[PDB]
Design a protein around this ligand. Sequence first.
Ligand SMILES: Cc1cc(CCCCCCCOc2ccc(C3=N[C@@H](C)CO3)cc2)on1
Ligand SMILES: Cc1cc(CCCCCCCOc2ccc(C3=N[C@@H](C)CO3)cc2)on1
Lengths: 273, 273, 57, 255, 236, 59, 59, 40, 40, 40
Amino acid sequence: TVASISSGPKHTQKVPILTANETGATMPVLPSDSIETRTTYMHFNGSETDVECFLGRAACVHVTEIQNKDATGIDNHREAKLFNDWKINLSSLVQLRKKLELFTYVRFDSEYTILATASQPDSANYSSNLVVQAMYVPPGAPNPKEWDDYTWQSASNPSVFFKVGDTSRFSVPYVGLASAYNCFYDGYSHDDAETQYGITVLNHMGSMAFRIVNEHDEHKTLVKIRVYHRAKHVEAWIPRAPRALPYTSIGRTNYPKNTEPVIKKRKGDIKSY
Amino acid sequence: TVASISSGPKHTQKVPILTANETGATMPVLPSDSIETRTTYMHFNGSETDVECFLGRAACVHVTEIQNKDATGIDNHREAKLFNDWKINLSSLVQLRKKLELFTYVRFDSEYTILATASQPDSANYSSNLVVQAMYVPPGAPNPKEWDDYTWQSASNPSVFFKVGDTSRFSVPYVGLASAYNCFYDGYSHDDAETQYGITVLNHMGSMAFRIVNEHDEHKTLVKIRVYHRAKHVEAWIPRAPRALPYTSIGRTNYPKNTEPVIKKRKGDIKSY
Amino acid sequence: TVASISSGPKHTQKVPILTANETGATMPVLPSDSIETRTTYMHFNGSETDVECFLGR
Amino acid sequence: GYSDRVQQITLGNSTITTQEAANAVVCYAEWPEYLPDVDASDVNKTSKPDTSVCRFYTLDSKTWTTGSKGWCWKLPDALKDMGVFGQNMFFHSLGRSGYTVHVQCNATKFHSGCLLVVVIPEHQLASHEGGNVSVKYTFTHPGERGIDLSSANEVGGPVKDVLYNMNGTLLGNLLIFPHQFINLRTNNTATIVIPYINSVPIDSMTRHNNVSLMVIPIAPLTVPTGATPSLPITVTIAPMCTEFSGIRSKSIVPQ
Amino acid sequence: GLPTTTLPGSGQFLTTDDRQSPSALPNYEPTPRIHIPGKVHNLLEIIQVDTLIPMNNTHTKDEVNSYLIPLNANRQNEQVFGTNLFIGDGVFKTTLLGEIVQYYTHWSGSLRFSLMYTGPALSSAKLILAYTPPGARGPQDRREAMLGTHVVWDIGLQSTIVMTIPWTSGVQFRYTDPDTYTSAGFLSCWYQTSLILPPETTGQVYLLSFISACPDFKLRLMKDTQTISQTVALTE
Amino acid sequence: GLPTTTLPGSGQFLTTDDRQSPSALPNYEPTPRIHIPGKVHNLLEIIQVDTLIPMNNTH
Amino acid sequence: GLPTTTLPGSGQFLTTDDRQSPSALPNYEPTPRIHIPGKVHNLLEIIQVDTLIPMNNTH
Amino acid sequence: INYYKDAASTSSAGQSLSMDPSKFTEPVKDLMLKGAPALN
Amino acid sequence: INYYKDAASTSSAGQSLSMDPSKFTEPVKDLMLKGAPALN
Amino acid sequence: INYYKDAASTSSAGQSLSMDPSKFTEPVKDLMLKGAPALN
Ligand SMILES: Cc1cc(CCCCCCCOc2ccc(C3=N[C@@H](C)CO3)cc2)on1
Ligand SMILES: Cc1cc(CCCCCCCOc2ccc(C3=N[C@@H](C)CO3)cc2)on1
């Protein structure tokens, strides 16, 4: 492939460099339309800018935490982190979010990796070996109330059991209701005067519940869960302007008030180098 | 292959042993040009002197250390080794350095092995099990400020998570900007009167950041990281004189003052055996 | 596979929507027996409702 | 003698002529088309009023003055009240449509000024409150009036800050969306053909707007000496290939 | 039982590796795809669309005005604007090009810089745009500027001028992030003759300026952008 | 000895995965199947039989 | 699931072994090679060039 | 590839792709045609 | 070799090697030729 | 068998078995024959 062809002096009536940008086109002008060039080859394919590659590496999408401790006398397991739960979503952390929102609709399979590490912040004789159990609780299915409810039987709901310190990995097909996931949605769930605006109403994915299977030892053990997400088989439509201001909320476009100028001011003139 | 052919008495006008070294050549003289020889075969190929073999074994290129401890009240994580960082480079340790600098330009893929072991120098009930996370922070990308910054999300930057005591291994393609890496560079980054001289300006490879993912236990744990590097797919150009004096700095050729004579003095005469 | 065929106005002596449930049958009535439909395809096989799948986790 | 410059668009019972055009943009290089069966889901036969809905409606005019910040209309909202297009809209459960948008602004060879005319698929607005305040329905359904970016923040309304496109992105990058400029010195109209863009084959026309049309002054209007300091901008829009499905009782929407 | 040996790296999680995994939802059937205009396949497809450069960066809070380069009637010989070409920083940084370049470590290729004139139709002007390849200082006067890559632009019916910064380089890749060794030059613009307004007209006229990449362009070695960060996880 | 590398997920138990296992009862012979009317293959087969709706829910 | 047995040496790191590894930079394209005079392939090539011997070591 | 000798040890079965609701939805002795009168 | 039955479980996809910027860079209705005048 | 997609991930290269010291041992412009006089 040639990156530049050889081109010499020109004295024409045919001027490729004068255009009318009002038309909305970006005319494909090249170095050889306005200087004299020599042949050179590309030596490159643009492999690593493919959208599959761009969205295809694992990104941290969520960090939660649960603890193993005596539940005796706990009136609210959920509240004691005896078993946390996460409202699956993909905009809670921003590195990956800005990347996805370069597109309007996106379609892909997900590969999740879940790393779990334990901490024992206060005096323990040892490090126990805990097994985590993460359940998929899609919307419409009983959601766990205690850390050892009938729910955890999970007879119809996919669940994975792995050890703290290890990693769990599995992959979920594209579960969207439509043909693509909306990265943006300028609508409501119905014509209500006070219903919420955004995608929050569309990206109804349900939540995922984690717990330790082990009963309690004499000390307490903090287990912190990190969920990583990798898109595989990516398809993206309609590019948009990149995010400039900071994010404030999952699912709304809102930016913070009295934010700071995002364009760097010159130290000098327009004329400055 | 014959290592020596059979050759007998000679009384010629054709003298292969008289030459003129002023020409710059090393004339290919053999035993059979000046004594009577018998046939012998080589029985050998020179396999283990191939440059791929010479540069192809893992060498320790870096030892760093980070600790897991309560960051509560630490004003400078980087400074507490709550997460160290390494300015990737391949001349910090010298065994491998002398080997590479036998050549001027070198091109290869790298295979890294990272061994991490833990130490608990002061009273602990136990040994905790820590997961290390090493990130590749190429130049232009946010560099970590605390041990748990958004940076560690590493949504676009390759990172590996492995356990202390284990080893991590992955391989990076030749990331040089030019066609080869310069082992030497007699230039500057620009014609500045005070800019630095050397390759420091050329071997801009960015740095690699390590941290423990675990929160803190009651005791403190020292984790010491050793990075090993193995060249694979090696290509080397222009041999040079081997390094004689000791090294003083990454990237400059400088030797120490009042160094010692590097040539061993005879215990005796020129005539001595 | 078609999920619905195209069907238009009807003025017949042949009424598929009147039945006698006392018989014990569930007559296979479709949208196209009582409204005007357009063609659409199924795009689906019913894979995940197989009893092997239902009892297989 | 055809110029890129003169054009005629006849759609239904209405025709537009421009003698000073700058080509026309067809979003994503695709022209509006009806919904194919292979893509269909709802089993209902759809209704295609054709020429009674696919004609040109001219919205009420705006006034560009030196202080203007820009205006924003949403589709199909802007047309919610135009003739039979609008009736069909409130009466069917689902509908689908593409449009031809023609923005008009003429001046003289002594004026200067340049407007950006852009179509943004799925333009989800931001609340000026920050945090996770929502933007109430009424605020994102201004109707033919559209939203006036130089009007004041209101409560439950969107933010109207132009350097941020009403969503946290910079004005400068709106050029990645199908768009055309109106530069008084060149141009006097902008025309964009919009194919139907959605993640579902057909949708509700009232709970979801699928494009915002935005006209933004970028090089300020500068009139000749002692000229009146303003020009009107007119927007005429025509639904094209419209289909409605799931007819019934007639939606009732807030406010 | 087949004998195996495990190698160094066993059990590691590398966020960039690509392997198979069990599906959690065995036998599930995804929604059919329908057609949607606009599919993107390569980021290289989109960085060829031009977007506006806030060249007039001299303000103090972001404003529509930093997109406008002003022009003065009747000035002769003088300089319209200047900038270095660190596409990952400074004016370029918020543009779509700048914004994507920042996801990669290295770039190589030609850039296309165009200027669209917005002055009254009855005015006229001749400007010179100059590209100065690495190695010299930003030009200080047109004489200096005109000795490097340049285009005399004659403002006419055809409203925009497209200047190309042809790839001039020893090393075949440059870092996006400002490197010296790797630096690309300067871009300046001066009056060639001068802007002239018709009667009954007055004041400043402005140029809009765009940037996009030529088909020439290469970007490699993905990394994280300095353009976005956060201090606590967001919630709904 | 063939060189291997284990990936993330090793040792996990996913209730939905489908793999082979050793039989605890090697060589055992199950009872022959006889014919039984009524075999169900898909839940889609049965949701097409109609059943009564307690529409008058007001009690 | 295929039955395996691990041998002595599993998990060891031998600095001299030569195996495959995942690339951290999937799909990256290295700079083209250009021609450079002087390529060395074997150390045996270079030890045939003669160099001076500090024979007079007595200093 | 089965690694094991017994049939019980193989993975899950594969979709019936049988599907015939008529034993449940139309177990009538004399065949009913849709469109013809239910009771003649 | 896929070891798993479902398509979601396969590795990353392979390069589009599609690439056609014209839907984004030249969505004009009447074709513009480089070198010919923009506005006739 | 390569298990990985990228070339960097393959094992060590295999012996040049190239070997030609003459660029280093005899870079003279006019060819010298062993046995013939060095300087004529
Ligand atoms: C055990 C176990 C646990 C699980 C979880 C199953 C995965 C379900 C999650 C489905 C994917 O979720 C989303 C959510 C949001 C988005 C998304 N939001 C927009 C910004 C873009 O994409 C995409 C996928 O499965 N088995
Ligand atoms: C996780 C994770 C961590 C990483 C690191 C990626 C590797 C980047 C390093 C690239 C190779 O670096 C160098 C540096 C210097 C030299 C060199 N200097 C001269 C003496 C010779 O060679 C060669 C390669 O990737 N993924």
